[PDB]
Amino acid sequence: AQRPAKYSYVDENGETKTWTGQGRTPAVIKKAMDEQGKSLDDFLIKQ
Numbered sequence: 001a002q003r004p005a006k007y008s009y010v011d012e013n014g015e016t017k018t019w020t021g022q023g024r025t026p027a028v029i030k031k032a033m034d035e036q037g038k039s040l041d042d043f044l045i046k047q
Helices: 029-034
Strands: none
Touching: none
């Protein structure tokens, strides 16, 4: 608990849908790969 699941991303809404729960793959990762990793580190918000 009290730890990041794996990563996060936005798509349907401006809010983070999150990878776990019901994100998995293939999903938003398609667009990320299409734009050539436009959110590699940005997935987990801003460092």
